[PDB]
Amino acid sequence: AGTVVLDDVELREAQRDYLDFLDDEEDQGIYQSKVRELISDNQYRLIVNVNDLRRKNEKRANRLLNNAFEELVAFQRALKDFVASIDATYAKQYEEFYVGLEGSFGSKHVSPRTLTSCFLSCVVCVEGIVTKCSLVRPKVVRSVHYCPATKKTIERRYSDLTTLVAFPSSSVYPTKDEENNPLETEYGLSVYKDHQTITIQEMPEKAPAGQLPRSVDVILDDDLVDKAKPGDRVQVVGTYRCLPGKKGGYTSGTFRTVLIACNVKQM
Amino acid sequence: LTDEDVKMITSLSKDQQIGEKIFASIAPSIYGHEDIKRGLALALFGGEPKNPGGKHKVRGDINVLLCGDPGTAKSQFLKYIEKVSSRAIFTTGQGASAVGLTAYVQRHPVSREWTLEAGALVLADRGVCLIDEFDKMNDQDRTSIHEAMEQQSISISKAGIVTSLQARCTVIAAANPIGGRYDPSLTFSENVDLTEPIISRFDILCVVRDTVDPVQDEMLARF
Numbered sequence: 001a002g003t004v005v006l007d008d009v010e011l012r013e014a015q016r017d018y019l020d021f022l023d024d025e026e027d028q029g030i031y032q033s034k035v036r037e038l039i040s041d042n043q044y045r046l047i048v049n050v051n052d053l054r055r056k057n058e059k060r061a062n063r064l065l066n067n068a069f070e071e072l073v074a075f076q077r078a079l080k081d082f083v084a085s086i087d088a089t090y091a092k093q094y095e096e097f098y099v100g101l102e103g104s105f106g107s108k109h110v111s112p113r114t115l116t117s118c119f120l121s122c123v124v125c126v127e128g129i130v131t132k133c134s135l136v137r138p139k140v141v142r143s144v145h146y147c148p149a150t151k152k153t154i155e156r157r158y159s160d161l162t163t164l165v166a167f168p169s170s171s172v173y174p175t176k177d178e179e180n181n182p183l184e185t186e187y188g189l190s191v192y193k194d195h196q197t198i199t200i201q202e203m204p205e206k207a208p209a210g211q212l213p214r215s216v217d218v219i220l221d222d223d224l225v226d227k228a229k230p231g232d233r234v235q236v237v238g239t240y241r242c243l244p245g246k247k248g249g250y251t252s253g254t255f256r257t258v259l260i261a262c263n264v265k266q267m
Numbered sequence: 268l269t270d271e272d273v274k275m276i277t278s279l280s281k282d283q284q285i286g287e288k289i290f291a292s293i294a295p296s297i298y299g300h301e302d303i304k305r306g307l308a309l310a311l312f313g314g315e316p317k318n319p320g321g322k323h324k325v326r327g328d329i330n331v332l333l334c335g336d337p338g339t340a341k342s343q344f345l346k347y348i349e350k351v352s353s354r355a356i357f358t359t360g361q362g363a364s365a366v367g368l369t370a371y372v373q374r375h376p377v378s379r380e381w382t383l384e385a386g387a388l389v390l391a392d393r394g395v396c397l398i399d400e401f402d403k404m405n406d407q408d409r410t411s412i413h414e415a416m417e418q419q420s421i422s423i424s425k426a427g428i429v430t431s432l433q434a435r436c437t438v439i440a441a442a443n444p445i446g447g448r449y450d451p452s453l454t455f456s457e458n459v460d461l462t463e464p465i466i467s468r469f470d471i472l473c474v475v476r477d478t479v480d481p482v483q484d485e486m487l488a489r490f
């Protein structure tokens with residue numbers, strides 16, 4: 001196998017605090033009601049008000065804003081646990097429950113121009129207009145293969161290494177068995193996730209007059225892919241990160257940045 | 268560069284006929300047109316710019332406009348001023364000039380370099396712009412020349428360049444009258460084919476009329 005963490009104090013504390021916040025039953029059950037509503041509506045993305053989160057635990061709010069990936073993963077674990085506690089079958093139906101953010105971001109609320117490298121790995125709420133969109137493509141998150149020669153059925157999993165170090169091993173699609181038996185993929189059994197890329201440009205009525213406009217690339221995934229079309233004045237709340245380059249040998253030190261959207265809103 | 272030069276030019280100035288000497292020395296290859304040569308001498312030597320406080324700018328440039336029927340050496344006058352004056356740039360109302368009146372920003376054809384090509388009005392910031400065929404200019408050229416003459420500045424708002432760069436040139440223009448023959452029956456404004464605001468910014472307006480005068484024709488043919 002490999003390294004497996006046992007006592008991650010920070011992760012345990014984050015999960016405990018997020019589950020305490022999501023309990024909400026004594027705190028007039030606002031997020032309890034929201035979780036129940038999403039359960040009924042058959043949704044798997046909870047939108048959390050950062051203002052309420054800060055009011056409950058300013059420490060957790062700051063940690064989430066300044067450390068996006070870790071705290072979002074902890075929040076999603078807590079949300080999945082809460083969803084299982086309220087209703088186990090739905091939790092088992094949906095593998096991962098996502099968390100998007102909303103509310104008043106003191107300094108993190110920026111535009112494509114003011115969005116600088118100081119916000120990398122942070123939660124940023126960027127306003128703008130969608131200059132272009134891409135076709136919704138499916139990325140395989142879990143492929144299933146069947147071997148006619150041996151009747152075996154294997155299942156490979158691919159992790160979401162969009163903004164993480166990725167190696168050729170993780171992104172190799174099996175095409176033979178260990179004995180060189182051709183495989184056949186079971187598309188129906190396989191798990192795909194819809195993925196789209198949009199471009200957010202600073203609103204012309206907001207951009208400094210006479211200058212060229214500033215843009216940013218945004219990545220949308222399952223349940224957020226088709227939330228906008230070109231010309232939409234959208235607010236994208238997401239995590240700003242550097243996209244890994246291809247395996248090189250010489251690096252120029254230049255890193256394309258992108259916004260992994262965790263929530264999209266229209267006017 | 269002027270040591271014995273500066274020694275002798277003072278004596279030439281004290282000569283006491285230096286004004287007439289200069290007026291006769293302008294355009295030695297052009298016969299007659301003493302008034303035009305005198306105006307060109309005054310334009311070449313220029314005036315004195317001033318600005319009460321920093322709020323009442325007044326130009327010190329003597330603008331000249333030679334409006335004349337064909338065969339009157341307006342082009343030769345402009346070319347001589349190009350040859351003599353330092354920082355003298357020749358542009359034409361047509362599109363067949365190396366430079367143009369209006370400034371743009373583009374990648375240069377030869378240098379392949381993204382360059383802010385300022386106009387022929389700016390390439391003579393402290394010199395002379397010789398605008399031939401002044402009556403045959405585009406709308407953008409007319410607006411650019413209006414801006415330069417009235418403001419002595421050129422404003423670009425093109426790609427991301429929002430700038431205002433100074434063009435304090437002296438404009439010597441050549442033009443033809445409506446119909447190709449100046450008619451004194453009508454006034455200069457309605458003879459020249461130019462807007463009144465454009466005309467107003469000219470200090471000297473040389474009406475180069477052509478008439479069939481025996482002696483003048485004989486002397487010009489001799490020359």
Ligand SMILES: Nc1ncnc2c1ncn2[C@@H]1O[C@H](COP(=O)(O)OP(=O)(O)OP(=O)(O)O)[C@@H](O)[C@H]1O
Nearest residue numbers: 296297298299336337338339340341342343487490
């Ligand atoms: N006063 C003059 N003395 C000597 N040569 C002259 C005189 N006027 C015209 N010429 C000569 O006659 C010809 C006509 O001159 P030029 O080509 O400059 O005309 P122009 O005034 O520019 O005409 P247009 O406005 O029609 O273009 C040229 O060869 C020029 O050298």
Ligand SMILES: [Mg+2]
Nearest residue numbers: 341342343441
């Ligand atoms: Mg001419």
